[PDB]
Amino acid sequence: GEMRLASIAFNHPIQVDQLNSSYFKLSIPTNFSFGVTQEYIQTTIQKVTVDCKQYVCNGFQKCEQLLREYGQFCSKINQALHGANLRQDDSVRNLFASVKSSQSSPIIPGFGGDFNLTLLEPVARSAIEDLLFDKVTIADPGYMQGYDDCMQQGPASARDLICAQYVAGYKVLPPLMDVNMEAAYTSSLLGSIAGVGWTAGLSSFAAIPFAQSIFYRLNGVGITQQVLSENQKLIANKFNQALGAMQTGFTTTNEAFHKVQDAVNNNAQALSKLASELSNTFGAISASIGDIIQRLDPPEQDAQIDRLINGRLTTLNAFVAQQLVRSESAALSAQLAKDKVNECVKAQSKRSGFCGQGTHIVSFVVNAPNGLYFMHVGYYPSNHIEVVSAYGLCDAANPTNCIAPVNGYFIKTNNTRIVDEWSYTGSSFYAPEPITSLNTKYVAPQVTYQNISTNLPPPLL
């Protein structure tokens, strides 16, 4: 069929009518689900260096003599590239300094109890990290066996730019981080889990079960403790369903996944731009220096060589500038990752904004090529209902006896188990309960507080 014109839909917010007087309508969810979002923060640029003699010419004596006039350009090029590479390694060390913890839990199979925890290493990296590496389309790795994979002692079907590295004079520097050490760093972060609570968490280490730290976080968002105790298996089930969705998360519609793939593509593009320029004439008779030498008398020969050399140098200068820009953006991105490790991961956060949009509950990070990949567990509200609520309550016999709810609301009761006309609820979920001193605090009196003439247990009198 023909493509169809359509309006862009605008989802309307649920309207809640404003009410006058001393009481108000309140919207509260009656259902929720766990769910996840993911992010990819690049932290590095692949490090490369350039032989500035071999890029231009390849041992022909005439161009070497000609190149000597321009030899200082290469010195500038090499120094700039070297400084760019030093910055990349500075960022790695700085990030790892925050990744490390003074202490951690040991990690064993069956960790997390009823939670499934597919992220655990196959003692290793992790199955999730390996799925990411398998989904990524990146060319086969350097270093070993290297140079002999360029060479005739291998398949004729190799198509690696890494073999072309030894033609062009490119050098790919190894990453500083070492993948085995990197895997150890991600397990150290998992060992800091259980947890972040029980004050700032910056000295002591709680060393408690993972499930207990989860209940703490759930009580930290206004879910009542009573609800948490009754739903413990239900919570684990909904949580595991959200985790199970990660097996479908490695798809092209996942934007974080897409960004990982494009970081890989950007590095490959920089090198392929460079390879194509080796064949680019600048009006020279041939891209090969030896060919123009063979075909020309030397007084004319170096006119052709000069045209060719200058265009080759110009592409190197542009190339360095491109790398410097990319290196700086990576450094900034690395700082952002460090901030999230010291905020979104190391603690529960109340900020909204950062982390996935479902309040905040514990988040995780795994290794990704050239960066970190974050996953954020979150809470999604559903099935909102409107209820009657009051700003506070006070004894009609004594105007100074005034209370207001803590982390929750006073609502008219709609529940058959509560004889009291009013009830306390959690703010994250609909959960009415009797009003007791544990869930309330004394406050200064206000005109909108209800005047209760009979039964209030807080204060009893």
Add this chain to the structure above:
Amino acid sequence: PGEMRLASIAFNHPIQVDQLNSSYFKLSIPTNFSFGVTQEYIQTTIQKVTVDCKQYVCNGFQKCEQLLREYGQFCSKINQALHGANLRQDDSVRNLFASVKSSQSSPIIPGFGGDFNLTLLEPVARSAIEDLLFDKVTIADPGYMQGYDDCMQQGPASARDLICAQYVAGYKVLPPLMDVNMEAAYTSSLLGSIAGVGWTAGLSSFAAIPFAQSIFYRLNGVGITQQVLSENQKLIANKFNQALGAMQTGFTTTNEAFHKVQDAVNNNAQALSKLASELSNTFGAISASIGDIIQRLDPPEQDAQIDRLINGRLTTLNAFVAQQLVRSESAALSAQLAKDKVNECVKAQSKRSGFCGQGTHIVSFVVNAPNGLYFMHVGYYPSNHIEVVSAYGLCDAANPTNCIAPVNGYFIKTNNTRIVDEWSYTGSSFYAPEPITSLNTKYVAPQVTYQNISTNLPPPLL
């Protein structure tokens, strides 16, 4: 006029307050305050454009068409680069708006906010304030519809728009990703997302309480005592409205945020205009026009002149792409900043300082602006500071384990004739003594600097 005057730059000295020896200290507290406003312009996007890579270079003259084939791969790189930059701009908008929307909101009605004036309410629409901004902006009229028929000979001879010059240069100005009415609805939803603000982080619940009520909650959130607030309720609304009314005079060139909006408009205009001038830029070629060099040259010569003309034209296009890539990335970073401000400066009161207006924090608002968002931050400005005597805490002299310290305020020696007690409590934000009661204090561990009270304290009574 007379001669100019050399002058020293003034240095405003801070009010000095003495550090003090032993168990008590001077305390500086304001005795007056006023509302005030600060504002910011955060750009979020770059205008999206594309360039026909054949039409910019030549006008379809056949000799160019034959010669251009040698360079056809440069154009593909140009088109792809611009296309990806434009894609990123659209993605950033969608990403931002996903956090802008609220799951629920109050309906917007006339007379909202009670005694507050609220000129931001829609003319049920955009807002009167947004319209003041758009009228102050000097930007050329939009295309699309009727578009091209305002460029065509059936129209005024006086148009000078770069927008109709678009059909000469091979330029295309892409339409903005969102209809302006949807954008207004996104910010209408933000207006309706106010209240709840308090009562936990507000993340799912919607308190749906009057705007004035939410303000008093915020004022207790900065340490102003409730008694003061109840006495001054009309006064507070009036001071607030005076600060609000000043926004109608805020659209001047002396407003720096306004100036940044004006510059954003001319950054887009400047980029396009540069290339219009480059159409006339000969590179030493016999003429900048291809048809001229065709009509005046034998074809063996003609082609050489055409190639020289083409080479410089391609070079300016390459430079232009580099310029666009830089601008697009800076806009993306700026958009990220806006996203955090929506989730902090707008959606909730914040204690951070720094961010938002320079007067603690109370509610802030955001409106649509060309290429961006414009923020206003209401703030609190202290005045008429006085020094008073204050104590670190109080304890029972007969029972040294009974020690208390003030909550959200300070213990002061009383200077008020209605309080018989020698000590009094005032809020951190304002000078206003009150009796010390259990509601304003908490029990603390004893310390040597606490006063030894041998007479009368009601919290604890004994």
Add this chain to the structure above:
Amino acid sequence: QLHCSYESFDVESGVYSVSSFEAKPSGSVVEQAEGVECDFSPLLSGTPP
């Protein structure tokens, strides 16, 4: 043309710009000085030689 720009037989979905119409040429309009007139009027009067 779109396929040639991506050097492939399978372009990714999207909206893409393509080259603009040239519009069209129309018959010429010219202005130049006129009427200079080689004056042969002496042939029309008096007796010829």
